[PDB]
Structure formats: structure tokens, C-alpha cells
């Protein structure tokens with residue numbers, strides 16, 4: 027990573043994905059507590075969340091770079 | 097409660113039998129990776145980093161074998177690759193890995209009655225595998241891992257002699 | 273037991289309240305007051321970094337709201353009458369509107385909470401759990417705000433801008 | 439040790455604890471032990487520093503050379519203050535290294551001054567008992583062992599005198615440095631400072 | 632083998648084991664046997680090497696020719712250290728060949744210095760008991776049997792003397808090598824070295 | 825302090841300590857003081873003996889001190905501090921290193937250190953190599969040690985007198 031805007035966008039996308047994701051009907055946005063998510067899914071909750079966060083972060087960063095917004 | 101993180105519960109797998117255990121496993125890898133596999137990887141990285149740190153420091157100080165390039169450790173990789181005699185360091189690595197790690201890895205994965213991770217029974221001098229010497233091994237290896245990471249990312253960043261700091265001993269000792 | 277939760281539970285590394293538990297209410301009042309002023313100052317820094325009022329700060333003087341920087345220089349470039357007005361406004365709001373101490377020093381209200389200075393017309397949560405959680409986040413945000421406000425003040429004193437070099 | 443379990447009260451303050459701020463009264467005994475240890479460390483460093491400027495202002499140096507490329511007189515040609523910069527880098531590195539060793543040893547001695555130990559009594563034989571390390575048994579404090587001829591009642595008086603002289607020394611060293619920086623700050627100081 | 636049982640303690644260090652580091656107490660039992668055999672080997676190698684270096688520096692050389700076209704004087708003309716490069720490769724090949732034979736034969740003897748053998752006791756007649764190999768029964772140590780006229784206590788005294796001479800010998804040989812490499816590091820080494 | 829030797833009728837029958845250092849001294853501090861006194865006494869005795877022998881017409885050693893550099897004994901002028909200035913720096917380092925090894929051995933070789941029990945000034949390596957004094961009575965050796973201290977006091981005032989005469993002229997009479 028190079029740019030502070032890129033880091034901010036990636037961090038925001040990762041946090042948004044982790045907050046709004048749902049596995050088997052459980053998610054933080056759906057009012058499941060952090061401790062229950064941690065016990066039910068373990069680090070699979072972070073790994074998948076950050077993987078899709080990186081995918082959407084790459085998509086938005088590349089789109090913004092193409093559009094000149096960044 | 098884990099001894100290292102006093103606001104989290106330690107995993108059941110860590111217990112206290114393994115050397116170097118300090119309850120440090122906040123994200124519990126030990127449930128998704130077998131502890132013996134993780135320990136074998138830890139010791140392999142630790143040993144490679146110990147050797148890497150001592151070799152980097154020696155070559156930077158100037159300890160050089162005859163007929164080799166007279167270059168710093170940063171450019172030593174490229175110089176050795178160019179000069180040719182660098183695949184013969186891979187060949188013993190190749191035989192050691194293929195004939196000791198792969199069988200040991202599959203023993204750790206499958207066999208229940210197998211040696212623990214990182215244990216090759218390598219005691220020529222018979223110094224001892226005490227739990228003090230395993231703890232010392234693990235601590236030195238972890239310190240060497242962090243030290244090698246720092247050494248490489250500072251040497252590449254600054255391009256300077258052994259201290260790998262911009263000013264020199266002055267950054268380690270601001271009084272200077 | 274409000275204040276105490278988080279990474280670190282009770283945290284009195286010098287044992288002030290442990291040695292003098294009678295003064296815990298006074299220390300809580302001081303902490304809440306500092307946190308409140310700190311949140312106000314930090315929000316002032318953030319919002320002055322982006323938004324500036326349009327209009328003359330004083331017709332007698334030649335200074336607008338746009339010419340002031342955001343820091344000690346900005347506070348310096350105010351007329352003495354305006355500074356006195358700010359001071360007396362703070363004095364009234366702290367002496368007659370929100371007095372932390374009913375009487376003298378170390379005499380916070382026993383019936384009311386240490387930082388219970390609002391009147392009847394205020395937002396109140398009639399639930400013990402929610403009230404406790406909201407007060408905990410209040411004091412914690414106060415701590416973070418005052419640490420950050422000291423950071424901003426020192427950065428602006430040294431360089432001139434609250435934001436430090438990148 | 440406690441509010442009254444530590445010496446250092448004199449007749450200058452009427453044999454009372456001179457704490458206008460009430461810090462000692464407020465913080466706990468553990469913090470009091472920390473404060474006493476820091477007090478004694480500051481006083482001892484200051485007693486060294488004050489007599490080490492006084493010699494610098496007097497201009498007395500050991501005969502000979504501090505290194506091959508620079509002399510003891512060369513390093514102190516710039517008055518007291520501008521001497522540490524003039525000293526050889528390896529020399530001050532060695533001094534700071536040995537001071538680091540002493541500090542780390544004193545901290546690693548098990549009966550810690552805070553956690554159940556005497557405040558101000560750093561161990562007289564540091565570097566002993568460290569695995570994989572050997573050093574001569576040169577007692578850091580009183581290597582000639584002047585303490586064997588003194589009784590405990592005399593040691594208490596000498597500790598009181600230590601604290602008083604140490605406090606006076608931390609006043610004096612700051613006075614000398616402030617006289618060097620600000621010319622007219624402290625009177626009775628010559629231009630050498 | 633085990634540190635208290637070895638004839639290593641002498642009157643140089645107060646009749647006490649000299650391990651400033653925690654090695655001997657950190658290593659197991661057989662590591663000490665390895666270290667003692669290594670100490671004896673280093674001591675004896677340096678004990679021969681220091682005498683050889685002294686003779687080379689003095690210039691006392693055999694009268695004759697080392698090869699049909701090379702003289703011992705010719706190879707010694709370049710000083711004691713360069714004589715090793717001056718001597719024919721096909722001759723130092725034979726020297727290293729016989730040293731290889733001696734080392735392998737000493738290592739092959741059963742009891743083994745780490746597996747229940749006396750450390751530092753190189754077995755006499757190393758080339759005996761080897762299938763497909765014959766060598767005359769010339770003992771490696773004392774071929775003239777000088778040890779026969781010695782008693783066990785006298786032999787222990789001479790073992791102590793061997794150790795204390797060998798340690799000084801390795802000090803001396805490293806002194807010679809460092810004196811050649813770094814000039815003036817070791818005084819008492821004139822231009823002949 | 826009274827138990828220690830070195831006191832004689834010269835100075836009555838009491839300890840000559842006007843400034844009271846022995847009063848401060850513990851028993852091991854007294855051991856340190858006696859060890860340092862003895863070392864100074866012996867070193868100054870050797871120093872003054874060598875100074876008188878060299879500067880009073882005595883035969884200098886034959887041969888070249890350094891054949892490589894050409895420095896020779898008679899080349900070294902028979903003069904205090906001039907002999908030392910003209911000695912090679914390598915030879916100076918040799919002498920200092922030999923004394924340093926000897927004193928490191930004195931420290932870390934003898935187990936009953938003079939600080940922790942023991943006896944000050946005992947160096948078994950250097951004394952009586954040929955067994956000159958292996959058959960003397962204990963009290964006779966005590967008298968001999970008293971004579972050692974007494975003679976070496978004169979020796980060390982003598983060597984300080986010599987360096988004073990060398991540097992500051994007119995410092996001593998009979999010069």
C-alpha cells in the first residue's frame with residue numbers, strides 16, 4: 027500500500043464488509059454480538075470478511091483511480 | 097484468562113506443556129491449524145532467521161569466503177546469483193527438505209505416535225533438550241525473526257552500514 | 273465503578289483513589305469536566321479546520337472570522353472586548369448554569385452524580401443498564417478527547433497546525 | 439516505604455514533611471517508594487554532576503590523552519558545558535553502555551524497591567548471578583568497605599546527610615547550568631560556568 | 632568426562648574449576664567429554680605448531696631438497712607462514728592424507744570418548760584391528776614406550792602438565808597468527824615472524 | 825589495626841594515622857590498605873634500586889634491545905625518564921602487559937582473596953623461587969616483614985624525591 031486515501035478506502039471497505047456480512051444468518055448488522063460471532067465462527071469470520079473486504083476495496087479503488095476521484 | 101492478554105481467555109490447545117507458551121493466541125489459530133504443525137513452522141522460521149541474521153551481520157562486517165563477491169548483504173543475493181555458485185546452497189536445502197520435512201510433515205499430520213514439531217533428534221554433542229534449552233531456543237528464534245524483519249526492511253530503506261539507521265549509533269543512542 | 277472497564281479495569285497506577293476513596297467523587301467530577309471541555313475543544317479544532325464563519329468579528333477592528341487561523345494564533349487575533357465576552361460567558365455558564373460543586377471545593381452533590389449539572393430539561397435514560405453504558409462512553413470519550421486535545425495543543429504550539437507532519 | 443516509614447525529615451523544615459502539594463499524602467505507598475528511589479537517584483547524579491562541573495570550570499584534567507587522535511585538554515577546551523560533544527563518540531558510547539548495564543542489573547535484582555524492597559538501596563554487587571556472564575566481585579558501593587566500621591544508628595544519620603547533600607546538589611547543578619545559559623540568573627558564578 | 636572428575640583444575644585459578652560462563656553446567660555429560668577431547672586436540676596441535684613456527688622464524692631448516700628441484704631453504708625463504716604455500720601441493724597432500732587417516736582411525740575406535748571412553752586419550756596403534764589394512768605396530772603416542780617407566784600419580788601430574796602447556800601453546804600460536812596479520816598487535820614478534 | 829604489622833619504635837608504639845583513615849576502615853578495608861601499601865612499597869623499592877644502579881655508574885646490559893630498530897642499552901641514556909622515553913613503545917607495552925597479567929593472577933588466582941580473608945601481599949609465584957626463606961621461624965619472618973615495610977617507606981620517599989628532582993629543580997638536597 028502507498029497512499030493514505032487507498033489505505034483509508036481499504037480499511038473502510040473491510041470494516042463495512044465485516045459489519046454487514048452474515049454467515050448462516052448471524053452477523054453484527056443483524057444484532058449478533060461480537061463475542062457470539064467469535065465463538066461460533068472463530069477466525070473464519072475475519073478471514074472471509076477481510077478477503078471480500080479486499081475484493082470490494084480493490085474494486086472501488088480501481089474504479090476511483092479510473093474515474094480520477096482518487 | 098491468558099497471561100499475555102489479561103482480557104481474553106487462552107485457548108484450550110495451548111495449555112502449558114509446550115515450550116515458549118505464554119498464552120499468546122488472541123485469534124485462535126490453534127483450533128484451525130494443528131499445534132504440532134504450527135510449532136514445526138515456528139521453529140523452522142526461527143532457525144532460518146537466526147542463521148539469516150548471523151550471516152547477514154557477518155557478511156556486512158566483512159567476513160567473506162574466498163572467490164565470492166566483495167559486496168554487502170543487501171546486494172549479496174544478486175551478486176551470488178550472477179556469479180553462479182548459489183544453486184549449490186539450494187541443493188542441500190533441497191535434500192534436507194525433501195527427505196526430512198515432507199516425511200516429518202506427513203507424520204505430524206497423520207501419525208499419532210510421531211515426534212513433536214521441530215524435533216529432528218539433532219543432538220550430536222548431546223548438549224541437552226531440556227525445557228530450558230527449548231525455551232531459550234524459542235525465545236532466541238522469535239527475537240531473530242523480528243530482528244531479521246527489521247534488518248531487511250531497514251537496510252533496504254536506508255542503504256547504510258551495520259546499524260541500518262539513518263544517523264547511526266546516534267539513533268540508538270540520542271545522547272550522542 | 274463507572275470509568276472502570278475496558279482494556280484496563282480499575283487503573284490507578286499511583287493509587288490516588290485507593291489511598292483517599294473519599295475523594296473519588298471529586299476526581300470523577302474533575303475528570304468529567306475536563307473531558308467535556310476536551311470534547312468541545314477537539315470538535316472546535318475539527319470544525320474550524322474546514323468551516324469558517326462569514327462576517328466581521330468586530331466592526332471597530334479590521335479582523336474577519338476568515339483571517340484567524342485555527343490555533344493559538346487564531347485565539348490571539350481577537351479583540352480584548354471579545355475575549356472578555358468569551359470569558360464572562362464561560363463564567364456565567366460555569367457558575368450559575370452548570371456548577372459542579374454545590375458549595376466549595378470537594379463538595380460535589382451527594383444526592384446527584386458528580387457530573388450532574390444539567391437542569392430538569394435534559395435528555396435522561398430511564399434504564400440503569402443504558403444509563404450506565406452511556407455514562408461509560410461519556411467518560412471514555414472524555415479521556416480520549418482530552419489526550420487528543422493535549423496532542424492538538426502541543427502540535428499547534430510547536431508547528432502552528434494541529435495536524436502534525438505526515 | 440510509607441508516609442513516615444522513610445527518613446529525610448530535617449530541622450530546616452521543623453522536622454515536618456515538606457509537601458505543599460500533598461503528593462505524598464495522596465498517592466499510595468508504592469508510589470512513595472518510587473518517589474524516594476527517584477529522589478535519591480537524582481541527588482546522587484547531582485552530587486556527581488555538580489563536582490564534575492566545578493572541576494570543569496576549574497579546568498583540571500587528567501594528564502595525558504583521552505585517545506590517540508584527541509587529548510584530555512582538547513576535549514575540555516570549550517569550557518564545561520561544551521565537553522560531552524567534544525568527547526570521543528566511542529568513549530561516551532562505552533560510558534552509556536556501562537551505565538545501561540548497571541541500571542538494567544539494578545532493575546533486574548529480584549527484591550524490587552517498589553514490590554517489596556528497600557527504596558534507594560540498589561544492589562551493591564550488580565552483574566552477579568546473571569547466567570552466562572562473569573564479572574569481578576567489585577562492590578559497586580563502598581568497594582573498600584567503609585560500612586563495616588559504622589553502626590546502624592550512624593548509618594541513619596549518614597543517610598539523612600546523603601539526602602540533604604543530594605537535594606542541595608540537585609539545586610546547585612541546575613543553578614550552574616542556568617548560570618551558564620542565562621548570564622545573570624544566579625549570582626556568585628564566574629564566567630567559566 | 633564429568634567436570635568434577637577431570638584433571639583440568641589447576642593452581643592457576645585457585646584449585647577450582649574455571650568456567651566463568653555457564654557452559655559446563657548447561658551442557659549435559661557427553662558434551663563435556665567432547666569439549667575435553669577437543670581441548671586436548673587443540674592444545675596438542677598448537678603445541679606442535681608453536682614449535683614449528685618458532686623453528687621456521689629462526690630459519691633452522693633441513694639440509695637437502697624437499698623435491699627434485701625445490702629446497703627446504705627455498706620454501707623457507709618467504710618466512711615461517713608462507714612456507715605452507717611454498718611447499719609442493721603434492722607434499723602437503725600426503726601430509727593431509729596421513730592426518731585424515733589418523734583422525735578417522737582415532738574416531739573409529741569403539742568405546743568412543745563420548746560413549747564411555749577417556750576423553751583426550753587417543754588410542755595407541757590407531758591402524759590395528761582394521762580389516763583390509765596392515766600397518767607396523769608403531770604406537771602413535773610414545774613409540775619408544777617412555778610411559779612404561781612412569782607411575783600412575785606421576786602420569787597424572789604429567790597429564791596436568793600437558794594440559795597447562797597446551798593451553799599456553801594455543802595462546803602462543805594465536806599470538807603468532809595475529810602478530811602476522813595485524814602488525815604490532817602482539818609485541819615480541821620481530822620482522823622474522 | 826593494632827594487630828597489623830609495620831609499627832616500630834620510630835613512631836613510638838602506636839599507629840601513625842593523623843587523619844584517622846584506619847578508624848573509618850573495616851577489617852577488609854585495612855586489608856586493602858595494607859595490600860596497596862605493600863604493592864607501592866615493593867614497586868618503589870625496585871624502582872629506586874634500578875634508578876640508583878643505572879644512574880650511579882652501574883654496568884648497563886650488553887647487546888641491542890631492538891636489533892630491528894637499532895636501539896641499544898648504552899644508546900638509552902643513563903638518565904631517569906630519558907631511558908623510558910627512548911625505550912620502544914612495544915617494549916613498554918610488553919612490560920605493562922606482563923605486570924598486568926601478574927596482577928590479574930594475583931587477583932583471580934589466589935582463592936583466599938585479601939579482601940575476603942586471606943593475607944595481603946602474598947604472591948606465591950614470584951617470591952623465593954629457589955627457596956631462600958623456607959626454613960625461618962614465624963616470628964623471625966614477622967620481624968622481616970616489619971623490616972620490609974620500614975625499608976620500603978624510605979624507598980618510596982626516595983623515588984618520589986628522585987622524580988621531584990628530575991622535574992622540579994632544586995626540590996631535594998644532595999643533588
Ligand SMILES: CC(=O)O[C@H]1CC(C)(C)C(=C=C/C(C)=C/C=C/C(C)=C/C=C/C=C(C)/C=C/C=C(\C)C(=O)C[C@@]23O[C@]2(C)C[C@@H](O)CC3(C)C)[C@](C)(O)C1
Pocket residue numbers: 310311312314315393394395413414416417418419420421423424434435436
Ligand atoms: C442537551 C439536550 O437537550 O440534548 C443533548 C443531550 C446529550 C446527552 C448531551 C446529547 C449528546 C451528545 C453530544 C453533544 C456528544 C458530543 C460529543 C463530542 C463532541 C465528542 C468528541 C470527541 C472527541 C475525541 C474523542 C477526540 C479525539 C482526538 C484524537 C484521537 C486526536 O488525538 C486527534 C488526532 O489524532 C487525529 C484524529 C489525527 C492525527 O493526525 C493526530 C491528531 C492529534 C490531530 C444528545 C442526546 O445528543 C442531545
Ligand SMILES: CC(=O)O[C@H]1CC(C)(C)C(=C=C/C(C)=C/C=C/C(C)=C/C=C/C=C(C)/C=C/C=C(\C)C(=O)C[C@@]23O[C@]2(C)C[C@@H](O)CC3(C)C)[C@](C)(O)C1
Pocket residue numbers: 425426427429430459460461463464
Ligand atoms: C488531596 C491532596 O493532598 O492532593 C490532591 C489534590 C491536588 C494537590 C489539588 C492535586 C492536584 C493538582 C495537580 C498536581 C495538577 C497538575 C497538573 C499538571 C501537571 C498539568 C500540566 C499541564 C501541561 C500542559 C497543558 C502542557 C502544554 C504544553 C504545550 C502546549 C507545549 O507545546 C509546550 C512546549 O514545550 C513544548 C512541549 C515544545 C516547545 O517546542 C514549545 C512549547 C514551549 C510551547 C491532586 C493531584 O489531585 C492531589
Ligand SMILES: CC(=O)O[C@H]1CC(C)(C)C(=C=C/C(C)=C/C=C/C(C)=C/C=C/C=C(C)/C=C/C=C(\C)C(=O)C[C@@]23O[C@]2(C)C[C@@H](O)CC3(C)C)[C@](C)(O)C1
Pocket residue numbers: 762763764
Ligand atoms: C610385451 C608385454 O609385456 O606387453 C604387455 C605390457 C603392457 C603394455 C604393460 C600391457 C598392459 C597394460 C595392462 C595389462 C594394464 C592393466 C591394468 C589394470 C589391471 C589395472 C587395474 C586397476 C585397478 C584399480 C584402479 C583398483 C583400485 C582399487 C582400490 C581403490 C582398492 O584398493 C579397493 C580396496 O578394497 C581393497 C581391494 C582392499 C581394502 O583393504 C582397501 C580398499 C577399500 C581401498 C599389456 C597389454 O599387458 C601388454
Ligand SMILES: CC(=O)O[C@H]1CC(C)(C)C(=C=C/C(C)=C/C=C/C(C)=C/C=C/C=C(C)/C=C/C=C(\C)C(=O)C[C@@]23O[C@]2(C)C[C@@H](O)CC3(C)C)[C@](C)(O)C1
Pocket residue numbers: 678679681682777778781789796797799800802803804806807817818819918921922
Ligand atoms: C612477554 C610477552 O608479551 O611475551 C609474548 C611473546 C611470547 C612469549 C613469544 C609469546 C608466546 C608464545 C608462547 C606462550 C608459546 C608457548 C609454547 C609452548 C607451551 C610449547 C610447548 C611445547 C611442548 C612440546 C613440544 C612437548 C613435547 C613433549 C614430548 C616429546 C614428551 O612427551 C616428553 C616426555 O616423553 C619424555 C621424553 C619422557 C617422559 O618421561 C616425559 C614426557 C612424556 C614429558 C606471547 C604469547 O606472544 C607473549
Ligand SMILES: CC(=O)O[C@H]1CC(C)(C)C(=C=C/C(C)=C/C=C/C(C)=C/C=C/C=C(C)/C=C/C=C(\C)C(=O)C[C@@]23O[C@]2(C)C[C@@H](O)CC3(C)C)[C@](C)(O)C1
Pocket residue numbers: 869870872873956957968975976978979980981982983985986989996997998999
Ligand atoms: C633523591 C634524593 O636525594 O633524595 C633525598 C631525600 C631522601 C628521600 C631521604 C633520599 C632518598 C632515597 C631513599 C631514602 C632511598 C632508599 C632506598 C632503599 C632503602 C632501597 C632498598 C632496597 C632494597 C631491596 C631491593 C631489597 C630486596 C631484598 C629482598 C627481595 C630479599 O630477598 C631480602 C632477604 O634476602 C635477604 C637479604 C635475607 C633472606 O633471609 C631473605 C630476605 C627476603 C629477608 C636521599 C637520597 O637520601 C636524599
Ligand code: KC2
Pocket residue numbers: 329330331332333350351352353354355357358361
Ligand atoms: C460569548 C458569547 C457572546 C455573547 C453571549 C454576546 C452577547 C452580546 C450581546 C447580548 C447580550 C450584545 C448586545 C453584544 C454586543 C456586541 N458584541 Mg458580543 N457576545 C458574545 C461574544 C462576543 C465576541 C467574541 C465579540 C463580541 C463583540 C460584540 C460587539 C462589538 C462589535 C464591534 O466590534 O463592532 C458588540 C456591539 C465583539 C467585540 O467585542 O468587538 C470589539 C467580539 O469580538 N461578542 N454581544
Ligand code: KC2
Pocket residue numbers: 504505506507525526527528529530532533536
Ligand atoms: C567508565 C567507563 C569506561 C569503561 C568501564 C571502560 C572500559 C574499558 C576496557 C575494559 C577493561 C577496555 C579494554 C577499554 C579500552 C579502551 N577505552 Mg574505555 N572505558 C570507559 C570509558 C572510556 C572513554 C571515555 C574512552 C575510552 C576509550 C578507550 C580506548 C581508546 C581507543 C582509541 O584510542 O581509539 C580503549 C582501547 C577512549 C576512546 O574510545 O577513544 C577513541 C575514550 O575516549 N573508554 N575501555
Ligand code: KC2
Pocket residue numbers: 818819820821822889890891892893911912914915916918919922
Ligand atoms: C619483563 C618483561 C619482558 C618479558 C617477560 C619479555 C619476554 C620475551 C620473550 C619470552 C621468552 C621473548 C621471546 C621476547 C622477545 C623479544 N622481546 Mg621481550 N620481554 C620483556 C620486555 C621487553 C622489552 C622492554 C623489549 C622486549 C623486546 C623484545 C624483542 C625485540 C623486538 C624487536 O626489536 O623488533 C624480542 C624479539 C624489545 C622490543 O620489542 O623492541 C622493539 C624491547 O624493547 N622485551 N621477549
